């Protein structure tokens, strides 16, 4: 049974839902507040989500539904994070392991800002996450994992062909990567399947710096245009 989307209120831990785009069966583990930067101070609520039969989602992407059976798979993770069927709006309540995992994630999610920008009817959404070491062997180097979502609001078909990353670090050294496709594939965005979301890692020295980029898109009429990636930062340990 599909519920209605909440217009003023977060989703309780344990709500079953489908993703607004590429609808997969997921369950929210806990929400976290993020800062939006729509280039086109404002906060926004995102959710840690455990997916099945196939991540961080937004509030507007959650399409909730209720069920009876233990629908979500990955039972080796739900038996550890959640408790069995009970009596509450979400019938899965959170176990103490999920509360400890939430307390462990809360500091690292503070270094995560969501950035958006719409260029020629192409909306890109980038959000970095931190996984690193204060000291890598021989020399201190830590990395990040940035999630990027491409969306085509226009009805015109278009395909991503080239990427043009430009990574600047704290030391003053800046890297520039012009590559073919994204994750070794060139996604197409049309009326059917208009969105594509991926994630990749970026290693860096000095444990600071910002990253901007450019995605090259091609239309069936031969025209190629560059969409901008909103410059997102890569910070560590309580600093903005
Ligand atoms: Pt990572
Ligand atoms: Pt992601």
UniProtKB/Swiss-Prot annotation:
The gene is POLDIP2. Interacts with PCNA and POLD2. Interacts with SSBP1. Interacts with PRIMPOL; leading to enhance DNA polymerase activity of PRIMPOL. Interacts with POLH. Interacts with POLD1; leading to stimulate DNA polymerase activity of POLD1. This is Polymerase delta-interacting protein 2. GO terms for molecular function: DNA binding. It comes from the Eukaryota. The keyword Phosphoprotein applies. One of its GO terms (cellular component) is midbody. Residues 116-240 form the ApaG domain. Keywords: DNA damage, DNA repair, Mitochondrion, Nucleus, Phosphoprotein, Transit peptide. It is found in: Mitochondrion matrix; Nucleus. The keyword Nucleus applies. The modification Phosphothreonine is found at residue 173. Involved in DNA damage tolerance by regulating translesion synthesis (TLS) of templates carrying DNA damage lesions such as 8oxoG and abasic sites. May act by stimulating activity of DNA polymerases involved in TLS, such as PRIMPOL and polymerase delta (POLD1). GO terms for biological process: error-free translesion synthesis; mitochondrion organization; mitotic spindle assembly; negative regulation of macroautophagy; positive regulation of focal adhesion assembly; positive regulation of mitotic cell cycle; positive regulation of mitotic cytokinesis; vascular associated smooth muscle cell proliferation.
